[PDB]
Ligand binder design. Structure first.
Ligand code: L56
Ligand code: L56
Ligand code: MN
Ligand code: MN
Lengths: 410, 410
């Protein structure tokens, strides 16, 4: 029986996690959902609690804590531990009845809960790429201290890469460990991208695109921030850095490829030049499920891939002139130090300004570029707590720098 | 160092094996070629012996044994154990200084050497698909007895499938064993086919295709028999049965799919519905190398797959009306017993009659069908020696039956 906690159970990752857990448990009783954690969606948490009956419930927003305790009295034969805030999150992480933790929270509570999961030697199914990009060094350090903790990637491309690896080798190392690529015989990574909604626009059309155009008739259901990142290809830029940290693959050995059908999720070239790829319909249930079952697989009732119906798969190189965010991401990664923290932070501001119609498409990369040019590399702290504080300082600095640049050329 | 014997070292598989061994050894000394075995190409064997300096040389033709003695005196600092015939093959198989044997021989002699390799608990890199189709029961029995012996597939599609599997699972079992698919969480196999030269042809056009049309195929270096089998899709038919035996996958769970670009070499759908595929340019060196390095991979200097240049991959269902050999292969496989032996034997005759312009395209399938219809299921011998004789008897009967059908019609 696999004992799981879901952090951010009402968000996109959380609800997909619970859906695939539900459907797999109908086939064979594999998962016990031991804990659910949400920010403030007390009614939805209640509905999930009624179905999954977790031992722990945690709500971040203290103002709905009493409402949750009263709602839960409706449920028959059920006495959960009901917790609140950061403190409740920490208690869940330290429970011996939880093996695996799904992190479905964005950058703030996300890195925070990831750190506590690692400190408690849990298996951590991590969807939050911003955390790896911004705090990669710190996560590596922490995993070197907490030797039984493991990060398993949930991001579709990174799960794909992970699924292409031989577990006989993966089991002798772990993600974010030095020499991971050597041990797994990895030579090169093809990181597949949908290309986003602006992939076929001319330069002249790109100058005038708005966030409405990016968010209009979205071929897949996702949040506004990641949709904007897909539009600029900064999503794939962040994913390049994520790939480098997760798998210890050199930046010269990570190739972004536009694959508009979104069937091949990424490919790995091994040192013999054989390439292995993972394929499925665009559906987050597979990456989530694999993070929870690894190194095994279990039966699902998901629709089988019909390759003849799919019929055609295409691949092309993205234009760095049309998508300068990719270039900026490689440059920041290659420069190393805290440049990735700065890249992620300045993008967070630039993304939000474009979303809210304050700046144009090419202003996004301009702002990020200027913040990166502005940054001065710092001595990397040896102490893990000092390092965390350093990352937080740089993140805050970079957000304020981007905002100041916006306010200058207002 | 990996100690490898090459059986049939001057044939296509054998020379490709020595090429990749040569190239990999320039990067790092990984392989010691300990034995070479050929039928009668004593000059080519001398040239290979001059480069690889194997401890054993063997020549099946007793007559040219004396000519090999005198040629090998020309090589300096080199006193090899020169053996001959089946007695020499067996002494090579019984050597404790040989780990792996590449079997690139066709017909009975390929099966006979395989048997002796298995009897000495060797790793057998097996390229002869006809031997698995015809003698699968016999090989399975032999592998159950000889617990440390293993067959590792060299056929490109079967190597691809094998490469897609998790070696943490593969190492708990081995090919041609009951429950292999269960242990490896395999749900379904996509068996990729080039489709051969006739995919767009109408039924009326297929009626009059000749072997010259099948063999006017300046694309990949392969022999006449397999080129004819590619044209009829009986090659894929035989590979379906091979798949069933190697990996214990049900016939209803093997799908032939036409992939004309020959980049994806086959795909495995696991029980979660995630699909893993292996990809490379059409090149037999990767499948051969993997059979010799499994469960590890080593560095090569092969050209890296350029996916953006490839650009497009296509897939479609083959038409069973146009390629009835595929339907017959499934039918023979599903019926079980010695029907695959009969299928293989009758195809051997029909293929050769078409190759020599004695029959037409649809006569191939017609002849095979009638032989299959004439065959009465036989009780499968429990004794290992009776079973080998049973297989040989049925093989012979089926070839005669096919020939008699041709002679009545002619
Ligand atoms: C839900 C789903 C699952 C697999 C693939 C897709 C297509 C969108 C892929 C990207 C979103 C993402 O980063 N995922 C899903 O990890 C969009 P992008 O490739 O950056 O244009 C969507
Ligand atoms: C040399 C090479 C290597 C990989 C793929 C190919 C394309 C021909 C594939 C088939 C030949 C074969 O059975 N192999 C190679 O195992 C021809 P087919 O798919 O039956 O039409 C050729
Ligand atoms: Mn992604
Ligand atoms: Mn083949």
């Amino acid at each position: 029986p696999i004992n799981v906690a879901i952090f951010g159970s009402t968000g996109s990752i959380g609800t997909n996690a619970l859906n695939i857990i539900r459907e797999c448990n109908k086939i064979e009783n594999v998962f016990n959902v031991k804990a659910l954690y949400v920010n403030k969606s007390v009614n939805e948490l209640y509905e999930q609690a009624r179905e999954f009956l977790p031992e722990y419930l945690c709500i971040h927003d203290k103002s709905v804590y009493e409402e949750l305790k009263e709602l839960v009295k409706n449920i028959k034969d059920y006495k959960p531990i009901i917790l609140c805030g950061d403190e409740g999150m920490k208690e869940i992480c330290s429970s011996n009845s939880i093996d695996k933790i799904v992190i479905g929270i964005d950058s703030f509570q996300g890195l925070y809960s990831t750190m506590y999961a690692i400190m408690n030697n849990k298996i951590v199914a991590l969807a939050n790429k911003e955390s790896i990009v911004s705090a990669g060094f710190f996560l590596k350090k922490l995993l070197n201290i907490h030797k039984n903790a493991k990060i398993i990637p949930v991001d579709s491309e990174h799960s794909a890469i992970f699924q292409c690896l031989d577990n006989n080798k993966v089991l002798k190392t772990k993600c974010l460990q030095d020499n991971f690529s050597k041990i797994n015989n990895i030579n090169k990574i093809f990181l597949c991208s949908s290309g986003g909604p602006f992939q076929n626009l001319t330069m002249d059309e790109l100058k005038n695109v708005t966030s409405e155009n990016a968010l209009k008739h979205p071929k897949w259901k996702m949040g506004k921030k990641i949709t904007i990142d897909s539009a600029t290809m900064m999503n794939k830029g962040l994913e390049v850095i994520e790939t480098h940290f997760l798998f210890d693959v050199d930046y010269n050995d990570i190739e972004v490829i536009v694959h508009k059908e979104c069937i091949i999720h990424s490919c790995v070239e091994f040192i013999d030049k054989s390439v292995i790829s993972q394929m499925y319909y665009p559906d987050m249930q597979i990456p989530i499920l694999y993070s929870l079952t690894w190194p095994d697989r279990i039966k699902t009732n998901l629709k089988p891939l019909d390759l003849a119906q799919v019929s055609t798969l295409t691949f092309h190189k993205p234009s760095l002139e049309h998508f300068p965010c990719i270039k900026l991401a490689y440059q920041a990664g290659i420069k190393g130090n805290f440049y990735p923290t700065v890249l992620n932070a300045s993008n967070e501001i630039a993304n939000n300004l474009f979303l809210n119609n304050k700046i144009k498409y090419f202003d996004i990369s301009s702002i990020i570029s200027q913040v990166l040019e502005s940054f001065n590399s710092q001595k990397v702290s040896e102490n893990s707590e000092d390092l965390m504080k350093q990352i937080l300082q740089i993140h805050s600095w970079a957000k304020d720098k981007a905002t100041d640049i916006y306010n200058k050329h207002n």
